[PDB]
Scaffold this active site. Structure first.
Site, PDB file in Angstrom:
ATOM      1  N   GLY A   7       8.676   6.215  -9.236  1.00 24.22           N
ATOM      2  CA  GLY A   7       7.465   6.294  -9.693  1.00 24.22           C
ATOM      3  C   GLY A   7       6.448   6.081  -8.476  1.00 24.22           C
ATOM      4  N   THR A   8       5.160   6.075  -8.851  1.00 26.64           N
ATOM      5  CA  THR A   8       4.127   5.738  -7.543  1.00 26.64           C
ATOM      6  C   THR A   8       4.164   4.251  -7.298  1.00 26.64           C
ATOM      7  OG1 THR A   8       2.343   7.282  -7.957  1.00 26.64           O
ATOM      8  CG2 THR A   8       1.776   5.029  -7.539  1.00 26.64           C
ATOM      9  N   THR A   9       3.841   3.880  -6.055  1.00 34.95           N
ATOM     10  CA  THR A   9       3.887   2.524  -5.585  1.00 34.95           C
ATOM     11  C   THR A   9       2.589   1.718  -6.222  1.00 34.95           C
ATOM     12  OG1 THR A   9       3.326   1.368  -3.405  1.00 34.95           O
ATOM     13  CG2 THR A   9       3.753   3.903  -3.391  1.00 34.95           C
ATOM     14  N   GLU A  20      -1.477   3.731  -6.499  1.00 40.21           N
ATOM     15  CA  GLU A  20      -1.581   4.918  -5.625  1.00 40.21           C
ATOM     16  C   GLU A  20      -1.400   6.023  -6.684  1.00 40.21           C
ATOM     17  OE1 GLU A  20       2.683   5.986  -4.389  1.00 40.21           O
ATOM     18  OE2 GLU A  20       1.596   6.973  -2.643  1.00 40.21           O
TER      19      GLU A  20
END
Ligand code: CL
Ligand code: MG
Ligand code: MG
Lengths: 232, 140
Positions: free
Chosen positions: B30-32, B47
Site C-alpha cells: 500500500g501507499t506510505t 501519499e
C-alpha cells in the site's frame, strides 16, 4: 407514557430577513417550579435553532440526537461546514420523521418542537412538529399557552405572507419580547428569565441568553379591594 | 506436515498465523502513511498516488475522522480501512452514549484492537488488510 419535568411555550415568527424564536428557562415539575437553569433553545450549526417544549427528559434526548446528527454529517464530508453543512430543512425532516415513527410505536416523544432557521438560498425556515407527528408551517408558530396568547399578538404584525418582507428585525424582536411578558403575566408555568435567538440571512445566528421580563405594569393592583362589595 | 496457510485461525507448527502474515503483504504494497505526535496533538499525512491525471485533485480523501477528536489513516486495502473506521465510529458512539465523555484515545485503540484481533479467531473470515495509524487528544 406520561410527562414529568416539563417546559412551556415556545414562540417564534418570521420577518424580512430571518426568524426569531424564544422560550423561558424553566423546567416545571407538576406545579413545582423546580428547575431554573433550563435552556430549551438548541442551536444546530450557524443557521438553525430548535426550540422545544414538553417533557424535559425527552428534550435532553432530542438534543443528543442533534449533536449526533452534526457529528455524523461531518464524517467523510469535506464540505460539512460549507455547501454540505446541515440545513434547517434537513434537521426538521429528521425530527419530524422520528416524532411520527415514535407515535406510531405508541411510545411518543412528549414534545412540541419548532425549528427556526435560514436556508442556504436565504429563504426563511419555520415549521412545527409534535408528539403525534403533526407538522405545519405559518408566519407565526407557538406551543403551549403561546398558541393561545402569543399567536394573536404576533399575527397582528405578520398577518399575511406579504407582511413578512415589511417586518423588520426591530419590530419582530419587540413583538416577541412583549409576548414573553404576556405569557409571564398569565401562564402559571412560566418564568421571568428567558432565552431568545435570531437567525438572519446577513447577520447569522445571534443567541441571547439570560433575558428578563421588564416594564411590567402592576401598580393598578393597589386599587383592587375585595371581590365585590368590600370597600377597604 | 504442510497445509497450515490456507485457513485463517490456524497455528502453523512454528506458532504463526500465516494468513495474518499474508495480510501484511497487502499492507506493505500500500501507499506510505505516517503519524507524528507533538506537544499537544497529532498529525496525520498520506501519499495519494496520482494513478492518472484523470483523478480529480484534492478529491479522493483518505484520512477519516472518528467522533470529533480522532483521526485515522491506513495503508493497504482501502475498503477494509473504511470498514474498520465504520466500526470505530459505532464503537465511539456506544461509549459516548453510555459514558457521555467522548471515548479516550487508548480506550478507542483497544476497541479497534479487540475487533481486529477478532478477525484472526475463525477461518470463516479473513484478517484486515490494513495497518492503521490513528490518535487524538483526550482528558490527559
Ligand atoms: Cl430514523
Ligand atoms: Mg408529577
Ligand atoms: Mg440559560
Amino acid at each position: 407514557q406520561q410527562p414529568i419535568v416539563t417546559g412551556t411555550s415556545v414562540i417564534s415568527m418570521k420577518y424580512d430577513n430571518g426568524v426569531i424564536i424564544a422560550a423561558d428557562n424553566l423546567g416545571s415539575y407538576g406545579s413545582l417550579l423546580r428547575f431554573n437553569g433550563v435552556e430549551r433553545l438548541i442551536p444546530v450549526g450557524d443557521n438553525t435553532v430548535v426550540g422545544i417544549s414538553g417533557d424535559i427528559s425527552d428534550m435532553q434526548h432530542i438534543e443528543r440526537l442533534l449533536k449526533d446528527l452534526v457529528t455524523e454529517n461531518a464524517y467523510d464530508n469535506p464540505l460539512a461546514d460549507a455547501e454540505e453543512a446541515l440545513e434547517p430543512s434537513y434537521i426538521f425532516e429528521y425530527l419530524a420523521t422520528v416524532m411520527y415513527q415514535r407515535r406510531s410505536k405508541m411510545n411518543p416523544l412528549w414534545n412540541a418542537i419548532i425549528v427556526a432557521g435560514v436556508q442556504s438560498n436565504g429563504d426563511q425556515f419555520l415549521r412545527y412538529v409534535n408528539l403525534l407527528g403533526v407538522t405545519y408551517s405559518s408566519p407565526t408558530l407557538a406551543t403551549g399557552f403561546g398558541a393561545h396568547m402569543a399567536n394573536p399578538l404576533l399575527r397582528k404584525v405578520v398577518d399575511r405572507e406579504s407582511d413578512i418582507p415589511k417586518t423588520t428585525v426591530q419590530v419582530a424582536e419587540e413583538a416577541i419580547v412583549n409576548a414573553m411578558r404576556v405569557l409571564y403575566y398569565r401562564d402559571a408555568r412560566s418564568s421571568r428569565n428567558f432565552s431568545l435567538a435570531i437567525i438572519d440571512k446577513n447577520t447569522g445566528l445571534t443567541f441571547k441568553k439570560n433575558l428578563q421580563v421588564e416594564n411590567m405594569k402592576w401598580d393598578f393592583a393597589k386599587d383592587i379591594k375585595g371581590y365585590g362589595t368590600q370597600k377597604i | 506436515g504442510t497445509g497450515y496457510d490456507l485457513s485463517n485461525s490456524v497455528f502453523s507448527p512454528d506458532g504463526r498465523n500465516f494468513q495474518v502474515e499474508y495480510a501484511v503483504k497487502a499492507v506493505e504494497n500500500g501507499t506510505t502513511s505516517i503519524g507524528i505526535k507533538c506537544n499537544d496533538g497529532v498529525v496525520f499525512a498520506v501519499e495519494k498516488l496520482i494513478t492518472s491525471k484523470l483523478l480529480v485533485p484534492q478529491k479522493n480523501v483518505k484520512i477519516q475522522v472518528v467522533d470529533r477528536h480522532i483521526g485515522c489513516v491506513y495503508s493497504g486495502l482501502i475498503p477494509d480501512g473504511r470498514h474498520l473506521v465504520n466500526r470505530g465510529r459505532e464503537e465511539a458512539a456506544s461509549f459516548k452514549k453510555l459514558y457521555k465523555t467522548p471515548i479516550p484515545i487508548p480506550a478507542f485503540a483497544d476497541r479497534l484492537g479487540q475487533y481486529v484481533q477478532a478477525h484472526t479467531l475463525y477461518n470463516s473470515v479473513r484478517p484486515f488488510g490494513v495497518s492503521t495509524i490513528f490518535g487524538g487528544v483526550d482528558k490527559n
